[PDB]
């Protein structure tokens, strides 16, 4: 895996490490790519344990795994926040985002890519006192 990392072959290394029977090959901290968030409205941590418990109970009483796909970290259970909105199109955002670093705003791949390449703009779509260039 280090040899694969030495070349620019990272997706191949991800394929190799994803289905490795040895669970402690690279890293011993477990989830090193986990990004836990605090809520933008109430400030408590987005863990959503009640929603996970309810969806696990519903998927145990039923016979489908698609109910558990309703679980996500785009909503808060403490303050009942509904969804996270895109910074450009203001649509719900559930599966893949694109974080703008200095200001902390989400966005789709297509929206952020259009705003920063097709329109050749340099600021955040939400409006921020700075330049989030390229």
The reply on whether position 78 binds another protein by CB under 8 A is no
Interface pick for another protein out of 18, 65, 82, 95 (rule CB under 8 A): 82
CA distance 95 to 78: 21
Nearer to Zn ion, 74 or 88 (CB): 88
Interface pick for another protein out of 4, 59, 70, 98 (rule CB under 8 A): 70
- 3-state DSSP assignment of residue 91: coil
The reply on whether position 124 binds another protein by CB under 8 A is yes
Q: What's the N-to-C CA distance of the chain in angstroms?
A: 32
Query: Phi and psi for 105 in degrees, rounded to 5?
Result: -120, 140
Nearer to Zn ion, 30 or 129 (CB): 129
Q: How far is the CB of 11 from another protein (least distance, A)?
A: 16
Interface pick for another protein out of 11, 40, 61, 64 (rule CB under 8 A): 40
The phi-psi region of residue 120 (left if phi > 0; otherwise alpha if psi is between -120 and 50; otherwise beta) is left
The reply on whether position 96 binds another protein by CB under 8 A is no
| Residue 8 CB contacts under 8 Å (≥ 6 apart), including other chains | none
């Amino acid at each position: 895996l280090l040899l694969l990392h030495r070349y620019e072959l990272f997706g191949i290394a991800a394929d190799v490490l994803k289905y490795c029977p040895f669970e402690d090959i690279m890293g011993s901290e477990g989830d090193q790519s986990s990004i836990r968030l605090f809520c933008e409205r109430c400030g408590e941590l987005i863990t959503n344990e009640s929603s996970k418990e309810k969806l696990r109970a519903e998927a145990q009483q039923t016979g489908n795994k698609k109910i558990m796909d309703k679980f996500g970290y785009w909503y808060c259970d403490s303050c009942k926040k509904k969804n996270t909105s895109c910074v450009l199109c203001e649509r719900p955002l559930k599966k893949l985002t694109m974080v703008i670093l200095p200001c902390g705003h989400e966005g789709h791949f297509q929206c952020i890519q259009e705003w920063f390449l097709d329109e050749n703009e340099q600021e955040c779509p939400g409006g921020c006192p700075g330049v989030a260039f390229i």
